[PDB]
Each structure stands twice: as structure tokens, then as C-alpha cells.
């Protein structure tokens, strides 16, 4: 009995997790048998919040619910239709809990792009046909905040293709005030950003394919422009015209092209805005105070703090999140230290010249995230324990005595759990811990003051008993040392793995900037089929360019994508070959996104190591991928700065060297991210070079190739490919 392709694809072994939503400092909403229940952590009791029958009034069309902080009204979301990675339109209707009836008067319009409640109370703000509206109460008629909205040209409250994807990780660009006085939001102008057109074939019944278009900026092209406003919603009236107020950007960033990259209310009358230059090695933070007398927002340069980078770019993917103290007088942030390691730093609102910040943590390891901030303490995920970059543990530093640094999750189950996450309550009195590997995931309820386990939310005992009689793979997380530096790797070893045998090897690569494909988390996936059922070892290596091990490693591939990380993969495979248990004749490399680009570049290096490989949705040329991401690591593609390196690092130029390998190129026709064009060009270059390869398009699939039937088909197609490449 082995974990089969069928098992992966049909989800027979289900890895359960525990989703809860904190609604107060002692209570969370959890879902059970489709009923929303309310559990109080302070006592032991559970009540019923919303019964499944109320969802069933809309049959099975409900995709989500969302409750008002005060608990009087619920947004039932139905008719979800996806757009991009985060974006979608949906219809909403407000269920009034007290009354137990749908609010049928002045209803939320259909095709609504983004709706969210205020942080307190029950005020609504929505985005519809690109304009922001706001309802003070559910029954009241809506108030139109902006009217500049146009399809694909002007976006208010919602994000552009590239802002969504690359800076915010969300369709939302509107943020409510802490007590609901103001509604901050960003506006993006897309006039002049060139369009990526592609064919959409749809159903059999559609006689003529439809051309889909998106304003999408590529390396060097005309980017979008941004404007940040704030509007007062307490003065919302049909009698008086609503005036939004425009906070303008810093002088430092307005000189050339720039991005808005963070929005963070600190208090009622203060909001922080980080902006970033288009080069991305310089970033400015602007703390902006509200002047009540003349209703303008002022951003002093005494209040402007600048983080920059000489070694590469700012942040993992952008400047880190500001966590401000209760009085707004100081704030905490993950910033890069003297030796390159990113740690927590304490700033002040005012910017004394000599001193940027005070580093409260330090060492050869990185703070992954700041999780909560009390007056007494700060909680944070870090990878310090046991010098394992791909490990995560909860820590708690006391604001007063930084000597008082306590690791809350390190030794609870040291064998089962080396990768934790956490979700703390409104004022942090309680928290849920989620161990995500290397054992079966375990979610448990704890009290903050002294870590005492109050409950066990989910221990995956069901999956455990299902997997007890299955021959699963092992997982070796360890390292090899090249040039006096440790570069970690993970290997999904087959069941009953013996060092006296020679197994085939598959390298699963991503290898992008700030990537980590070797860590302690637990995954049931294609690799586990490949190890258990096929006896393929699947290894992944985090060489240069990988994150969480100091900037010296991460910025090592700066201005030079397709070089040091590409050869580091090739080198790793050599290092594993030296370990002796790998057959040199059967070594493979596969990957998706950046991984696909890396696999294509490794296959074309002429190294002689790798025999075959599969690129899925790959990048071929860096001038095709979007500006915000591409330019973060390469600069512009112009002679003034780095055009040669865009030219040096294309898959196309290495087509001659594909004559030594077996290549399987795959791409979805309706990919809006890494457009099909990129694979269309790789194929054209291989054909011109007289190279036989294999290919598979996927009609109407995006970057995910996520559709249930297409998903089953890609992984079955690739499995058969590897089956032939390794002679079974």
C-alpha cells in the first residue's frame, strides 16, 4: 500500500487544519458541521452563532460570511467568480442576527469587487464598478465616495493587476480608521500602461474565441501611477458634498517613478504610508498627522524615516510592516542589520540624524514576522532555534528588559514540531498555535501570560490512523557546506530508504529571490507520490538568492538572475551525487514559475548532469515578466543600466544545449501572470535550433492550472514523462 497518484489527486488522505476567527479578546468563531459556533476561551463553553439552515436559504452558492465587530449583522457572500490571484466579484446580502431576516432594503449591488466592515461597529465600505461607496448602517442608502471609476483605467479602493500581484497581495486598497472616522484608500491610473492581449476559448458553444486584455506593465514599460486619499465618513451627508483629502508623496520619491507599498493607521488622527522608488534600493516611510483646524494631513520630514540598501533591494519583497505602540510615539519594524541579518528595530516618530533605529534582537538568523505588540511585550516568528533557517518558532521579547527573551514553542514537542504559526486574540490574552511540520499538523489553544495549553483544537488523529498502514516517505532536512557557508537542502526519501542502493533523483526547484524550498513543514503532495510509489528521491536546495539567511546570501544574485542560483542548483545535484546513493544516469529537475525558468536554464547549461526536465509556466526572458518584480532584482532593461544582463539570461540563447536533454514544456493558454508568450518563444527557439522536445498547452488555464480536471491531467502527464525518463 503506497501513496498513489490517485491519492494525491482525489485528496483521500486529508490533512486537516483548524480555522478560527478572533471576535474579541476571549472569544473566537469556529466552524463545525457547517454551523458557525462561538467559543469562549476564558471559560469552556460553546454556543451556536449561525446555523447552517441560514446559509441554505442561498442553497450552495455561499462562498463566505463576515461578521460586524459589534455582532449585530453578517454579510453572507454568494456567487463568487474569481478574477486574478486575490481578486474576484461576488453578490452580498446582509443577515440581521437580532431580527433573523435578510435586510431587503437598499441592498449591496451584484458584481461587488470588494466589501469590508469598519474595525469596530457595523459601518460598511464597498467597491463597485471601480468606485468606493459607504453605508453608515445596513438599512441606510449607500453614499458614493468617488466617481472617477473606469474598467481597466482608474481603480479606487481596489488594486491594479501589478499592485495586487506584486506589492499588496490583495484586491483591497481601502483601509478603515481605528474608530471609523476616516476611510483611507489608494487610486491607481492605468492610462498608458501597455496591454497584454490573449485568446479565451471558453465553452464548446462559443462560436468565436474572445480576446481578453489586461493593463500589465513589463520590464521597463510605462508603470501605473498612484494617489493616496482619506475621506471623513462621519460627515457623510446627501445635503453636503463629500471632499476626500489627498496625502501627497514625499519629495524623495516624487522625483521619478514610485510605488505606494504600505498603509498603517497608528491612531485616529495619525496614519503611516511607506512609498518606494522604482529602483527599489531606496524606501521612505511617511508618518502623517491630521491637523483638525484646517482638515489637511501633514507629513513632516522630521517624521520621515529612510531605509536603503547598497547590497541589493529593500525588504524580502517590500519594506516591512510598521507595528506602532499604543500612544503612537514609537514603532517596531523588521529592518536589515549591520551584518545583513533582518531583526526587529525600535524607531521613534521623530528622526534624530545620527541614529536610525535600535536593534532589540540580533544574531546569524532572521525575524520572520512581528505577530503582536502589547505595552509589556512583542511576539514574533523567528528561525533562530537550532540554527535552522527553515524552522519557525514563537518568541516573546519584553519591551522593557530585552534580556527577557522567551521562546514559547521551542520544546513543546521537539520531535513532532519544528515549524510553528500563531494567531493571537484582540488584546493578546490568548493565542492558537499551529505546528505545520515535520509531523502531522497540530493546532492547540494556549493562554498568553504563562503558556498553559487550554485545549487541543485538532491533532489529525484521523489522518494518522489512515496513514499508519501506508508506506510514507521520510524527510531529511540537513545541509552541505560550499565556500565555508552552509546551504540547506531537504530530500523526500522513499520508504525504507537504504544508502546501499542507487535511486533516481528529481530536483524540485523554485530558486527565486527570497525563496525557501527546504524547511521543516509537512506536505502531502506529488513528491510523496513520487517517493512512495515510484522510488524517486525528490530534493530541493536553497542556494544563493534564497531568503532568511542574511542579505549576503539573498542579494548574491542581485542584478544577475539566471547565474549564481542556476549554477547553485547544478552544484547541489553534484553534491548529492557525491553522497553516493543517487544514479548519475537518472537525475531530473522540474519546476513552476521562477522554478520553471531555473529548470530551463539548468537544462540549457550543458552541465551534463541532468538528463531530463519539466518547465511549467516558465519565465523565458526577463523583459516579459512584470515591472514591480523583475526590476526589483535586475534594474531597467536599458544600456544605461544592465541591458546586457537581460540579454545574457534568456532561455532562448541556450537552445543548442537542449540537444543533450529531454524537455517537457507546459503552459496554460489563459495565464495572465507568466503569459503563454514566454513558452511560445521557448518553443520557437528550440524549433529554430533543430531540437526535439515535448509540450502541452492547457486551454483556458491560468497560472495555477487549478481546474479539477486540468490539475489531474498535468500531474498525470508529468508522471508519465518521468516514468519514461527514468525507465520506470
Amino acid at each position, epitope marked *: 500500500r503506497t501513496y498513489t497518484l490517485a491519492d494525491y489527486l482525489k485528496n483521500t488522505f486529508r490533512v486537516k487544519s483548524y480555522s478560527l476567527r478572533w471576535v474579541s479578546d476571549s472569544e473566537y468563531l469556529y466552524k463545525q458541521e457547517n454551523n458557525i459556533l462561538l467559543f469562549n476561551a476564558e471559560h469552556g463553553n460553546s454556543s451556536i452563532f449561525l*446555523e447552517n*439552515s*441560514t446559509f*441554505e*436559504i*442561498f*442553497g*450552495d*452558492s455561499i462562498s463566505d460570511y463576515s461578521v460586524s465587530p459589534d455582532r449585530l449583522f453578517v454579510l453572507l457572500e*454568494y*456567487n463568487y*467568480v474569481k478574477q486574478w490571484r486575490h481578486s474576484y466579484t461576488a*453578490s452580498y446580502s446582509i443577515y440581521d442576527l437580532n431580527k*433573523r*431576516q*435578510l435586510i*431587503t432594503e437598499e441592498k449591496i449591488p451584484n458584481n461587488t469587487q470588494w466589501i469590508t466592515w469598519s474595525q469596530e461597529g457595523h459601518k460598511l465600505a464597498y467597491v463597485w464598478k471601480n468606485d468606493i461607496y459607504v453605508k453608515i448602517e445596513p438599512h441606510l442608502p449607500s453614499h458614493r465616495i468617488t466617481s472617477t471609476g473606469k474598467e481597466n483605467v482608474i481603480f479606487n479602493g481596489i488594486n491594479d493587476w501589478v499592485y495586487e500581484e506584486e506589492i499588496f497581495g490583495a484586491y483591497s486598497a481601502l483601509w478603515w480608521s481605528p474608530n471609523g472616522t476616516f476611510l483611507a484608500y489608494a487610486q491607481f491610473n492605468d492610462t498608458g500602461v501597455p496591454l497584454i492581449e490573449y485568446s479565451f476559448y471558453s*465553452d*464548446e*458553444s462559443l462560436q468565436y474565441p474572445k480576446t481578453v486584455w489586461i493593463p500589465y506593465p513589463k520590464a521597463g514599460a510605462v508603470n501605473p501611477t498612484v494617489k493616496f486619499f482619506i475621506v471623513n465618513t462621519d460627515s457623510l451627508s446627501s445635503t453636503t458634498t463629500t471632499i476626500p483629502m489627498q496625502i501627497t508623496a514625499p519629495a524623495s520619491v516624487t522625483t521619478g517613478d514610485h510605488y505606494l507599498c504600505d498603509v498603517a493607521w497608528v491612531s485616529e488622527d495619525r496614519i503611516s504610508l511607506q512609498w518606494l522608488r522604482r529602483i527599489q534600493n531606496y524606501s521612505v516611510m511617511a508618518i502623517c498627522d491630521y491637523d483638525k483646524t484646517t482638515l489637511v494631513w501633514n507629513c513632516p520630514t522630521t517624521q520621515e524615516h529612510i531605509e536603503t540598501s547598497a547590497t541589493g533591494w529593500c525588504g524580502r519583497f517590500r519594506p516591512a510592516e510598521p507595528h506602532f505602540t499604543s500612544d503612537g510615539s514609537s514603532f517596531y519594524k523588521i529592518v536589515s542589520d549591520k551584518d545583513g541579518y533582518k531583526h526587529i528595530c525600535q524607531f521613534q516618530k521623530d528622526r534624530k540624524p545620527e541614529q536610525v533605529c535600535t536593534f532589540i534582537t540580533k544574531g546569524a538568523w532572521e525575524v520572520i514576522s512581528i505577530e503582536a505588540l502589547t505595552s509589556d511585550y512583542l511576539y514574533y516568528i523567528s528561525n533562530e532555534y537550532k540554527e535552522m533557517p527553515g524552522g519557525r518558532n514563537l518568541y516573546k521579547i519584553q519591551l522593557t528588559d530585552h534580556t527577557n527573551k522567551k521562546c514559547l514553542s521551542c520544546d513543546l514537542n521537539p520531535e513532532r514540531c519544528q515549524y510553528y504559526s500563531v494567531s493571537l486574540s484582540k488584546e493578546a490574552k490568548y493565542y492558537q498555535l499551529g505546528c505545520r511540520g515535520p509531523g502531522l499538523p497540530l493546532y492547540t489553544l494556549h493562554r498568553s501570560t504563562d503558556q498553559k495549553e487550554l485545549r487541543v483544537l485538532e491533532d489529525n488523529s484521523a489522518l494518522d490512523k489512515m496513514l499508519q498502514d501506508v508506506q510514507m516517505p521520510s524527510k531529511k532536512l540537513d545541509f552541505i557546506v560550499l565556500n565555508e557557508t552552509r546551504f540547506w537542502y531537504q530530500m523526500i526519501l522513499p520508504p525504507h530508504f537504504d544508502k546501499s542502493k542507487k535511486y533516481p533523483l528529481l530536483i524540485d526547484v523554485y530558486a527565486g529571490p527570497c525563496s525557501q524550498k527546504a524547511d521543516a513543514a509537512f506536505r502531502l503532495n506529488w513528491a510523496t507520490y513520487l517517493a512512495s510509489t515510484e522510488n524517486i528521491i525528490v530534493a530541493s536546495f536553497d542556494g544563493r538568492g534564497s531568503g532568511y539567511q542574511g542579505d549576503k546570501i539573498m542579494h548574491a544574485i542581485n542584478k544577475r538572475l539566471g547565474t549564481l542560483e542556476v549554477e547553485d542548483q547544478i552544484e547541489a545535484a553534484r553534491q548529492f551525487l557525491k553522497m553516493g546513493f543517487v544514479d548519475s544516469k537518472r537525475v531530473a529537475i522540474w519546476g513552476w514559475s521562477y522554478g520553471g525558468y531555473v529548470t530551463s536554464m539548468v537544462l540549457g547549461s550543458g552541465s551534463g548532469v541532468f538528463k531530463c526536465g519539466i518547465a511549467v509556466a516558465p519565465v523565458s526572458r526577463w523583459e516579459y515578466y512584470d515591472s514591480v518584480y523583475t526590476e526589483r532584482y535586475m534594474g531597467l532593461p536599458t544600456p544605461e543600466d544592465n541591458l546586457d544582463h537581460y540579454r545574457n539570461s534568456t532561455v532562448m540563447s541556450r537552445a543548442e544545449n537542449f540537444k543533450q536533454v529531454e524537455y517537457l514544456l507546459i503552459h496554460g493558454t489563459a495565464d495572465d501572470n507568466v503569459h503563454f508568450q514566454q513558452s511560445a518563444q521557448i518553443s520557437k527557439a528550440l524549433v529554430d535550433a533543430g531540437v526535439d522536445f515535448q509540450a502541452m498547452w492547457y486551454t483556458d488555464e491560468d497560472h495555477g492550472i487549478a481546474s*479539477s*480536471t486540468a490539475h489531474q491531467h498535468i500531474y498525470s502527464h508529468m508522471s508519465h514523462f518521468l516514468q519514461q525518463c527514468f525507465s520506470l
Partner: antibody
Framework: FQLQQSGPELVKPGASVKISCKASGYSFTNINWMKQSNGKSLEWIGVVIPKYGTTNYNQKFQGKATLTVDQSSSTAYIQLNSLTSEDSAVYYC?????????WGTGTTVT | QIVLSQSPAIKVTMTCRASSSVCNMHWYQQKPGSSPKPWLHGTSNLASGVPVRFSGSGSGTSFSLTISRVEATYFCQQWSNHPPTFGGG
């Protein structure tokens, strides 16, 4: 499980008629009505959740088909209002568990 | 607002094409004078009281109902989108 629907009724211009599903043999406590016109397909009117008074209706069956339930009596009531020629139809009741699990025998309102 | 259109109006096999993607499709068999009974749900599951010859298949817009080895007015309805809607017959 069976639902002995009320006998057929005759109605004329301007008037309002009430109809009873009379569910039995199952743990009552969702119920929906579909209007079927003769020679044509089925069309969904609305839903009542019998435990509470919670009602959801179709677009523009506001006014028509006021759906209310009082649990004590083993039944559900659909009041169609201001009937015209179009409102003359078969009107079934149903029980909703995953889809339309069981159906009432119909009233031929005229 | 979703429109189910059934091709044939006739192993005979009727189809349903939906105007948009439905998660699951339900089927109801009817005869003249008599209230309809549940025949198929969750795309392919045979409802109780229905002979084993019957099948269901297809995901997205194109669903299909396959009566194996036909022997002696089937409607198709969806509730993945609101409001719920029925096929012609």
C-alpha cells in the same frame, strides 16, 4: 417522508389565496415552493427555514408569495396575492436537504 | 440568472449546458399529472428509488445524464448560483 398538500383552489382577478403543504414523517424544523405553469418548466419562488421566520425570496416575487410558517400546526403556508392569468399554475412544495429531497402533490390554482 | 439549456428534447443520453459554471447538477424525472421525484444529485449520485442503469457526468458548463440500456421528461436544476434554476425538459 411525505407531504400531503392541500386540495386545488379557484381564484379570480385581484384576490389572494393561501395554500398548505402539510409535511409529515420526517424531522420538520428548510421548505421551498416552485411554481409550475402548464406546458412549461419549474421556477423557484422562495425559501422558509421552519425553526425561525427566516425567509429569502426571488427577484420580483416581492409582494406575491408571502411565505410564513408556524410550527405547532404540522404545515407551511404560501399566500399568493392579487392573482392574474399568469399566476394560475401548478404550485408544488418541497423539502431542502442537499437538493429537493421530497415533493408535495401540488395544488392547481386557477 | 443561470440558464440551463437541455439539447435534445427527444443508451440514450440527454445533456445540460449551463450559461456559467455550476459546482453540481441535480436531476428530476417527471411524468404527466404526477409530482416529480428526485432522480440524480451532486452531479453523478443516483437518488434512492431509481434503477441502477442511470448515470451522471461532466463538470463546468457541460453536464450529461446517461441512461444505460433504456427501458420503460427529465429536468436538470442547479443551486451553485443563486437563484436556483431548472432546465426546459
Amino acid at each position: 417522508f411525505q407531504l400531503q398538500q392541500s386540495g386545488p383552489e379557484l381564484v379570480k382577478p385581484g384576490a389572494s389565496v393561501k395554500i398548505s403543504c402539510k409535511a409529515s414523517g420526517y424531522s420538520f424544523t428548510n421548505i421551498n415552493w416552485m411554481k409550475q405553469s402548464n406546458g412549461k418548466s419549474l421556477e423557484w419562488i422562495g425559501v422558509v427555514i421552519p425553526k425561525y421566520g427566516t425567509t429569502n425570496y426571488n427577484q420580483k416575487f416581492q409582494g406575491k408569495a408571502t411565505l410564513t410558517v408556524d410550527q405547532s400546526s404540522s404545515t407551511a403556508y404560501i399566500q399568493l396575492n392579487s392573482l392574474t392569468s399568469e399566476d394560475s399554475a401548478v404550485y408544488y412544495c418541497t423539502r431542502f436537504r442537499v437538493f429537493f429531497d421530497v415533493w408535495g402533490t401540488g395544488t392547481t390554482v386557477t | 440568472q443561470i440558464v440551463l439549456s437541455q439539447s435534445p428534447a427527444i443508451k440514450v443520453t440527454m445533456t445540460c449546458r449551463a450559461s456559467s459554471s455550476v459546482c453540481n447538477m441535480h436531476w428530476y424525472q417527471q411524468k404527466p399529472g404526477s409530482s416529480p421525484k428526485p432522480w440524480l444529485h451532486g452531479t453523478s449520485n443516483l437518488a434512492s428509488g431509481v434503477p441502477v442503469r442511470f448515470s451522471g457526468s461532466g463538470s463546468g458548463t457541460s453536464f450529461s445524464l446517461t441512461i444505460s440500456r433504456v427501458e420503460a421528461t427529465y429536468f436538470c436544476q442547479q443551486w451553485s448560483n443563486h437563484p436556483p434554476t431548472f432546465g426546459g425538459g
